[PDB]
C-alpha cells in the first residue's frame, strides 16, 4: 500500500529535536518541552507527488546502549542529525551521533541529513561554512532550519525522505 518512512531525529540537548518534529507534524512551535519526553510522530504527507506516511522518532531522555535500544535505532531508515547554530558543543557532538548510527546500521551508507537549527537567532557561534565542510566530509546534505519560523523545516525532513528513496535503488 502506502509507503512509510521511518525517520529518527537525534542530537544534543536543547538543539530543537522536539521543536522541529512538533512543528512539522503538529503545526506549531513549542517554547519549551521537557527533555525526557520521547514520542513517535506520524502524518500522511505528499512528497514529490507521492502520498506517504512519516513515522518520526523524536529521541529524548538518557543515553543508553541496551540491546533493545540499539535494535530500536536499527529500525530507523534515515536520521536527522541536529545541532543548534548558537551551541558549539552540540556541533562538536555530531561526530558521536554519526558513529552510533554507523555502528548499529553496520554501514557508512545510511540516509542522513545534517541540520543546523535556530537559524532565526542572531549571534550564532557555529560558522555555516564549517558545518558545510563537515557535511561534505560525510557526504550528506546540510540544511539550516528554524523550528520557530518553520524556515527550512519541511525541506530538511523531505530531503531525508529523498535520501531514503535513493538508498532503496
Ligand atoms: C536533553 C536530553 C536529550 O535530548 N538527549 C538526546 C538523547 C536522548 N541522548 C543521547 N545522548 C548521547 O550522548 C550524550 C553525550 C553527552 C554525554 C556523553 N555523551 C556522548 C557525547 F559526548 C554526547 N548520545 C545519544 C546517542 F548516540 C543516541 C543514538 C543515536 C544513534 C544510534 F544508532 C544509537 S544506538 C543507541 N543505543 C543510541 C543511544 N543512546 C543511539 C541517542 C538515541 F536516542 F538513541 F538516538 C541518544 C543519545 C541523551 C540527551 C543528550
Ligand atoms: N529561537 C529558536 N528557538 C528554538 C528553535 N528550536 C528550538 N528552540 C527552543 O530551544 C529550546 C530547546 O528545544 P527542544 O525542542 O526542547 O530541544 P531538544 O532537547 O533537542 O528536544 C526550547 O526552548 C525551544 O523553544 C529555533 O529554531 N529557534
Ligand atoms: Mg526533546
Swiss-Prot record:
Activity regulation information from UniProt: Alternates between an inactive form bound to GDP and an active form bound to GTP. Activated by a guanine nucleotide-exchange factor (GEF) and inactivated by a GTPase-activating protein (GAP). Interaction with SOS1 promotes exchange of bound GDP to GTP.
Signal peptide: none
Impact upon substituting residue 23 to E: In CFC2; exhibits an increase in intrinsic and guanine nucleotide exchange factor catalyzed nucleotide exchange in combination with an impaired GTPase-activating protein-stimulated GTP hydrolysis but functional in interaction with effectors
E.C. number(s) listed in UniProt: 3.6.5.2
Modified residues (N-acetylmethionine): 2
UniProt: GTP binding residues: 11-19, 30-36, 60-61, 117-120
Post-translational modification: Acetylation at Lys-105 prevents interaction with guanine nucleotide exchange factors (GEFs).
Recorded consequence of changing residue 39 to A: Decreased interaction with MAPKAP1/SIN1
Residues the record lists as N-acetylthreonine modifications: 3
Effector region (motif): residue ranges: 33-41
Residues glycosylated per entry: 36
Consequence of substituting residue 41 to A: Decreased interaction with MAPKAP1/SIN1
Gene Ontology biological process terms in this record: actin cytoskeleton organization; cardiac muscle cell proliferation; cytokine-mediated signaling pathway; epithelial tube branching involved in lung morphogenesis; female pregnancy; forebrain astrocyte development; gene expression; glial cell proliferation
Domain of life, source organism: Eukaryota
Compartmental location: Cell membrane; Endomembrane system; Cytoplasm, Cytosol
Effect of residue 147 to V: In OES; somatic mutation
Effect of residue 61 to R: In CFC2; characterized by a defective GTPase-activating protein sensitivity and a strongly reduced interaction with effectors
Predominant localisation class: membrane
One GO CC term on file: membrane
Annotated phenotype, changing residue 62 to L: Promotes GTP binding
Record's function text: Ras proteins bind GDP/GTP and possess intrinsic GTPase activity. Plays an important role in the regulation of cell proliferation. Plays a role in promoting oncogenic events by inducing transcriptional silencing of tumor suppressor genes (TSGs) in colorectal cancer (CRC) cells in a ZNF304-dependent manner.
Disease: Leukemia, acute myelogenous: A subtype of acute leukemia, a cancer of the white blood cells. AML is a malignant disease of bone marrow characterized by maturational arrest of hematopoietic precursors at an early stage of development. Clonal expansion of myeloid blasts occurs in bone marrow, blood, and other tissue. Myelogenous leukemias develop from changes in cells that normally produce neutrophils, basophils, eosinophils and monocytes.
Family membership: Belongs to the small GTPase superfamily. Ras family.
Protein name, per record: GTPase KRas
Amino acid at each position: 500500500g502506502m509507503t512509510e518512512y521511518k525517520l529518527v531525529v537525534v542530537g544534543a540537548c536543547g538543539v530543537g529535536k522536539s521543536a522541529l518534529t512538533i512543528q512539522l507534524i503538529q503545526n506549531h512551535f513549542v517554547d519549551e518541552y521537557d527533555p525526557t519526553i520521547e514520542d513517535s510522530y506520524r502524518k500522511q504527507v505528499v512528497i514529490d507527488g507521492e502520498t506517504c506516511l512519516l513515522d518520526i522518532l523524536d529521541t529524548a531522555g538518557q543515553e543508553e546502549y541496551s540491546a533493545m535500544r540499539d535494535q530500536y535505532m536499527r529500525t530507523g531508515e534515515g536520521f536527522l542529525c541536529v545541532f543548534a547554530i548558537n551551541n558549539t558543543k552540540s556541533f562538536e557532538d555530531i561526530h558521536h551521533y554519526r558513529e552510533q548510527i554507523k555502528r548499529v546500521k553496520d554501514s557508512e551508507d545510511v540516509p542522513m541529513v545534517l541540520v543546523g537549527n535556530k537559524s532565526d537567532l542572531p549571534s550564532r557561534t557555529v560558522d555555516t561554512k564549517q558545518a558545510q565542510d563537515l557535511a561534505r566530509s560525510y557526504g550528506i546534505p546540510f540544511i539550516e532550519t528554524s523550528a520557530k519560523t518553520r524556515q527550512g523545516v519541511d525541506d530538511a525532513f523531505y530531503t531525508l525522505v529523498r535520501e531514503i528513496r535513493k538508498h532503496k535503488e
